[PDB]
Amino acid sequence: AVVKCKPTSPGRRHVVKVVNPELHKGKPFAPLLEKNSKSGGRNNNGRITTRHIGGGHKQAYRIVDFKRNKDGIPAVVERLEYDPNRSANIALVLYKDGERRYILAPKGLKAGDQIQSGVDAAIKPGNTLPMRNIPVGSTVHNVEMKPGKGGQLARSAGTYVQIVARDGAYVTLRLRSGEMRKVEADCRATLGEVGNAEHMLRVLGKAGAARWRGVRPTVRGTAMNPVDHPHGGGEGRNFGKHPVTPWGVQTKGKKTRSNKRTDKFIVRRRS
Amino acid sequence: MKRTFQPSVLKRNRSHGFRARMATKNGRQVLARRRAKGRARLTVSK
RNA sequence: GAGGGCGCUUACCACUUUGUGAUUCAUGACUGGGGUGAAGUCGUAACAAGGUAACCGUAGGGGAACCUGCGGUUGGAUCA
RNA sequence: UCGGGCUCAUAACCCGA
RNA sequence: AUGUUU
RNA sequence: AGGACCGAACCGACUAAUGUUGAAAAAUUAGCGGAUGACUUGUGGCUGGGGGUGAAAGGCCAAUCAAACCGGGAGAUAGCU
RNA sequence: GCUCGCCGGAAGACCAAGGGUUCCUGUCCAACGUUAAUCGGGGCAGGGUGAGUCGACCCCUAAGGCGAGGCCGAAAGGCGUAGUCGAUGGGAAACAGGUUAAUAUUCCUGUACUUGGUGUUACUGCGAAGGGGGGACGGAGAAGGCUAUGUUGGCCGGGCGACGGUUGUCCCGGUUUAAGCGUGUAGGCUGGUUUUCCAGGCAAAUCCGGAAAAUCAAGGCUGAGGCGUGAUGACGAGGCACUACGGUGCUGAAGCAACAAAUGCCCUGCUUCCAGGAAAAGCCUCUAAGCAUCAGGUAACAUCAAAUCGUACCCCAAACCGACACAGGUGGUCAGGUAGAGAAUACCAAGGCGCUUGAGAGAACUCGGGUGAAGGAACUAGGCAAAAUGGUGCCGUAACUUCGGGAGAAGGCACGCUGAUAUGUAGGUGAGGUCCCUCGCGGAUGGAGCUGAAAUCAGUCGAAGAUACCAGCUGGCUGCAACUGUUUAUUAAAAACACAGCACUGUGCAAACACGAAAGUGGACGUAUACGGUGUGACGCCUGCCCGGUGCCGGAAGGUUAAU
RNA sequence: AAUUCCUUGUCGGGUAAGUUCCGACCUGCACGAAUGGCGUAAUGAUGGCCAGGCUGUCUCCACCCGAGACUCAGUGAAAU
Ligand SMILES: [Mg+2]
Ligand SMILES: [Mg+2]
Ligand SMILES: [Mg+2]
Ligand SMILES: [Mg+2]
Ligand SMILES: [Mg+2]
Ligand SMILES: [Mg+2]
Ligand SMILES: [Mg+2]
Ligand SMILES: [Mg+2]
Ligand SMILES: [Mg+2]
């Protein structure tokens, strides 16, 4: 559920929260945690590598089973948690053999539901299955990319990949982006839309929200001086340049894409 | 006003102490040069 | 002495003052529309099937009447 | 622009210079 | 298209 | 609840007077802004010079920064004084 | 030595960082001290820093650093695995009193505690670089309980007053007591114990996870404080003696209660929110390799040990950073009284101080102040600076508005003292006495005593009752930016930057991008509701035409065109 | 107009008088749509203007309390 705040103070007036009741409250499941440590966008050289990174809350890591094995063993999802390290939401799951794990959290999610993965596995929202045994048209969660690897496509709140054809020993997939891309078919993948989707509607509302979220401000190129960034200068405002990156690298449609080593797998580019 | 030299011996020893000097090709070279000048205190100690 | 009067004091209370509001009348640089006028200038929207049938409401566009979409009505002509 | 024509007649339109 | 004249 | 209100500490530094061989190589004094936050601070760590860092002023990088300091090439050159 | 003044959330008192003998005692004064100097943080001598339990080493880990081999690199060397270091963070133990010219949770007295070896004696499956558990954690907020701590009375010791009064509802002072041990409360949390079964916990496990039945309702962790004990003591005004007038012995009263009360403690709790909130060891338990009369495990008691190094002094400064005994800078801890909302402020206590030139004079002028006739912004670039406002409760309060606001708008009224209601009220706290009871850190009933605002009425003094210090001036029109925020440390704080929101645009993950000749690494343990680039800059109403030029995107048919 | 040169444009308002301010005109030397346009409650140590209060800011100074300045005594500089 999304909520508007009363304007008892500018900077709250525009806030729009997304508060989910069916979320667990308080500390997570201890054993599936581990350190994290911020990086200030900085290198192993100590150099800022990616700008705008730093500050923001503490953040301990939830393991989150991406491969989805435990074939045959069923599990019952005890609860849905909040994970600070993704837009997605989290399911604490518990298998019949007495083992707990974290799983993403489909659209249907819901504590009490039953879950299972493997070649057998019934096609039901929330289950994992090599795509070879998955009706063409299904909508499917976090999709592996190499059979076995981990799943990487459609991991984000509201995302989902539609299977559009499975000729050959490969499947063609309509990613969220628009692109259509073949993949190994023996490749795992969970049933259903990834959860939440209300994400999209948050508003933040004041600079601090992003601040306490690890996003330091961005200073336009025009604001600076000729010696810092390819833009900037001119007595007042101005521009008269050819829109480029601070390293003079040209912008505004240049693609940069360059693989050849993976072209094959791309059947039709986004638009 | 708050001046530039705020003392701290941990740091002092870590930035310009004997071993830090001893820990890198050029550091050692700093020692060489000084010993060759006949300096009485290579590095600063107890 | 008692009683009264004057004086003083208290209560009510007209002027009068201070603040901030409602409200009505006159007026105001400029300015929207509306009414009336003799032959002006531009086109010709409506009237006949008015030469894109007309209108109502709504919205967008345009020197102008008006154009265009959307739905609705017939207060529409033909043997369609 | 000018002369001729179409029109009841102006314009448009057509013709000739 | 107009005629107190596109 | 609040980058909410008033207001000490603490962070700042808008005005004025003084000072300007100062008490001080940037202060004092009377006022001033913020003050649960993009808050403020101790210790320790990382980034190194055409490079870092910058809510961007060419601001900051050990009292100096349109390219630091130290040594070296070096007795650079100087149709100038 | 007697007075006078100054700070008292410091100008006191402790700690760290830093200094590094400034500490204490003699002695000296050239130089150092902005003067003198007999005095000093000066000179010279001599003295002084006592630990099982305070700190450090040590155990453990963070960010980060190093790093056998290894991967890269013309060389130098860059990176990194096993590891190994690294505190600002986790890990066992002591309190009060006394003492020295100077040390003391270190010496001394008193009274405790920790963990290991040995020994003896009873009882017993012990055992890992390993599993689980624990350690282990955010923000804000709301009380309840409690202590530190204070007031008053009671108590005790002393006093009966330089000038009217003062044997009393009078005056002064003190009224202190730790760890540890016992109890295990206010209160917080969680249902227990049993047996059996298993595709998990890199192997096993009697552990943790999961599944079944069984069977009990009270059980188990947690926990400030109070009380008892420590205390037969210590401390304690003051006595009485000696004094080399510094002090040294010996001695010692009272030592309670009620009330108030933190920002500390119960509380790493509780309620709740989103930004979702270290690691590892010690520790508890679980097995394995194994040892199986052993050894080890438990407990009581006895004994031995607990090294080493730091320990003076300064500390919001004359001892540190500032060239100075420099109006600057500098992290943590404590928090008495009266008044007060208070860590503001004003006066004091304790404690420390009057700032290392002094003495006179009492001009202009300058500095910093106090008061001002009439006038009151005429001054001036400009009301710069002054002067003014200045508390609390209540009444009351416009346009506009994003319905919060604007508003502390504005503007008014009350404000001291005494008496009364009421020899001190509503409230608070709360003992006897009474009863009960799962019996006591119980409950119920009881309302003594102790505490104590506010209100109305009557009365009263002054020029004036928020009386000092403290302590918003208010109102109308308009530009710019929505706003909190940031910036030129040292002439600019702004209308500049940033911002939430908006758009364009790139990127399919070995991503685009970025640091790096590379290995590696950031992006991201993320994955198009994400991440980078650019412009715009809340929100409302909106964002038209132009693709010629430049830029960018797609396109090949031809013309041209490189090495070859 | 943070943009208007001509410019103290012109009219209205406020003033005893107003190169500023406010409202208007539009002839925009040389606004205008994310180089964002035009609005906008709140906010601002923000630029411009007006009013009450207040005043030594002033007409126009006066007195007074402190620190220097002046005399004595010790030390004892500087720029040039
Ligand atoms: Mg941005
Ligand atoms: Mg600039
Ligand atoms: Mg510039
Ligand atoms: Mg310009
Ligand atoms: Mg009118
Ligand atoms: Mg018509
Ligand atoms: Mg028609
Ligand atoms: Mg129609
Ligand atoms: Mg605030």
Ligand SMILES: [Mg+2]
């Ligand atoms: Mg100040």
Ligand SMILES: [Mg+2]
């Ligand atoms: Mg404030």
Ligand SMILES: [Mg+2]
């Ligand atoms: Mg500098």
Ligand SMILES: [Mg+2]
């Ligand atoms: Mg040089």
Ligand SMILES: [Mg+2]
């Ligand atoms: Mg040369």
Ligand SMILES: [Mg+2]
């Ligand atoms: Mg030379």
Ligand SMILES: [Mg+2]
């Ligand atoms: Mg002398």
Ligand SMILES: [Mg+2]
């Ligand atoms: Mg001394």
Ligand SMILES: [Mg+2]
């Ligand atoms: Mg000495």
Ligand SMILES: [Mg+2]
């Ligand atoms: Mg090696």
Ligand SMILES: [Mg+2]
């Ligand atoms: Mg390395």
Ligand SMILES: [Mg+2]
């Ligand atoms: Mg270690």
Ligand SMILES: [Mg+2]
């Ligand atoms: Mg430490």
Ligand SMILES: [Mg+2]
């Ligand atoms: Mg001492």
Ligand SMILES: [Mg+2]
């Ligand atoms: Mg033994």
Ligand SMILES: [Mg+2]
């Ligand atoms: Mg473990």
